Symmetry: C4
Subunit: 213 residues, 4 copies
């Protein structure tokens, strides 16, 4: 019943945080949700404390990642409303909704690429700098800076409005721009496909390892 | 021949409902399709009744989901044209075209995510509220409300016009907006891929279970 | 050498057809490509005839689909330039480039859904008619007609500009329009994924059947 | 330590090339990065030379593709700043960042379609020419030329703004244009899916061959 009680509050406070967003609800029942917040934080501190002793020596609790998360989460919520950064700590309190992941199984269940990731990162950097020198002057919004180039090239990998929005217009100035992007799309696309082809093989392999165990 | 006769009418009435849409056809042969509708509903009531007795004791019919569906469908079509909600019941009559699914096999053949679905739902809620507070004032159409945020964030997951349509314009006001969406896209995208990676493993597993049976 | 000779011409005439497109090239070497066309058609008729006798009794040739294709293709190209439909037959001549598929292996190599396809078709028809009645008046371009609805709903399945281009604007008039499309997208998307999940299982199964053979 | 030393410089020069992009940084520390470039090129020439002798007889070095790449890369960087094409050789120097791929394993690890690729290429050519004759006059930007048609048809395969951006507008002039594109999309899409269905089967097969070895 302990866990169920906690999971319940999480959902309850979770829905309340959404109500706290509405400026309207805030005028009438501003305090009501305010107090309920103080109450939940308290019950959670008590919960955390209990768990601490029960975990085994207090140490073990600090060993578990899920527990430490719940600890840190509650800690931030504990910090007085006022503070150097009243707002940030105030907003980070919403992170407690993440408690839902820890408290309930399965979710945690769901929650080998580095190599390819690094290669791709290198690729983006290369084309990012090249693109900047190639279209920054004429297209300052997209290619103006290295960071602007990074974001635009990420947009093209997602293939969102790459032609109509980016390439077609750029071709007006530079007819050969297609030479730059088509190849980029091919390489980027190709890697992504292989990446997936690799994640699933490791997936199926895990299934077999599971049967062995 | 009984089933074939029924499947035939379904297709016939199915094509007629499409004709009933055209205001033009309505003027000339309005009545012709009108009468054909009354006739089909009748033959279907007779059909349903027959099935009821044949199913075994009348009970069994009420046991089958496909049969109950056909029952409820026909029932709605039975309700007099006029009624409190003449229109709704009148439009719901089109649901009888769904009879095609029940009557013919295979279709029914085609017709383990909850966990991930819940996690994602939680995620959208979190970002939905955050986005509302972050861009609602400046971007009332997209972020104005919690529900508006939900729809816009769903659009970005589909990756449709996220950059050109949403992000680029939002960056004008908030340059850091990219920090909010890129991460969102990664998380959302990542889950989706894993979700698929899981549905297919359960799929292939079913294939093996089938051979065992 | 016979086949190689034929494959060569195909590629040669194939490149020529592309040149025949340019109005410029047409002025200078209009005749040159014109004559080369007559020559190739002739050599192909001779080829077809030879094959006919060689196939075994002439009959067998008419048994093979690839051969009949090549036959029909050449036949159309044989029809005099002038005719009732000088243009159509003239343009259909380009179909001979398809000879490349027949003549060369592998291509033919590359070149269980019906059930789902039918279900989906039914689905589109249902929503197509519903959409027409729902937004045709206000949105005649997209929903104006049943066929217009079909094309727009196909666009949304491809997920191309569904929100920014279609849904967002439609919401201006109808705020609940999202209720109609989101569900549509889910159903359509879901089926597509399962469809793929099925094509690949049949694919892998074929691989195993191949090893058995 | 030798390799680590080299991998380090690569990353260091890699970050410097990105700084060399900024016109601002260029004014203050233009020379500083300039000299560091000369120094790295030197250490790399020495590196290449050492490897040459160590490879076994100098020959073997010239046998390895990775080594030859590193050789050619450095060679271009060696060419004096000034030259017939001062700029091109100057820009190609960035290719040395590719050294990262050679020097570090894994990347190289990541780095059976021809048949389908050829078929698709043929397909694009066919539709490319047809599209040109069909919409070039009215739509010169998209269909104006054979090459313009190629790029636009590639855009539609990516499914980016095909309807809203291309098809819808084209329908204004030609209502039947949908007949041309829908089929194109189906064929192109279908092949792509099968292509993937084939790459992964070869992938999984390699996994099995690996266990055999």
């Amino acid at each position: 019943r302990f866990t169920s009680a906690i999971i319940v509050l999480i959902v309850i406070n979770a829905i309340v945080v959404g109500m706290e967003t509405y400026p309207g609800i805030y005028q009438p029942y501003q305090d009501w949700f305010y107090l309920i917040d103080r109450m939940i934080l308290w019950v959670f501190t008590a919960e955390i404390i209990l768990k601490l002793v029960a975990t085994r020596p207090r140490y073990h609790f600090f060993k578990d990642s899920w527990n430490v998360f719940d600890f840190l989460i509650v800690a931030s919520g504990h910090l007085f409303v006022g503070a150097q950064f009243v707002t940030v700590l105030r907003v980070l309190r919403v992170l407690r909704l993440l408690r839902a992941v820890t408290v309930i199984p399965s979710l945690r269940r769901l929650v080998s690429l580095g190599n390819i990731m690094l290669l791709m990162g290198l690729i983006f950097y290369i084309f990012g700098v090249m693109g900047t020198f190639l279209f920054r002057d004429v297209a300052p919004e997209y290619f103006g800076s290295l960071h602007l180039s990074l974001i635009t090239l990420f947009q093209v990998v997602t293939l969102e409005s790459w032609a109509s929005g980016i390439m077609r217009p750029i071709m007006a100035e530079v007819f050969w721009s297609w030479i730059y992007f088509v190849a980029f799309i091919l390489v980027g696309t190709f890697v992504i496909f292989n990446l997936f082809v690799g994640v699933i093989v490791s997936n199926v392999e895990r299934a077999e390892t599971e049967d062995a165990e």
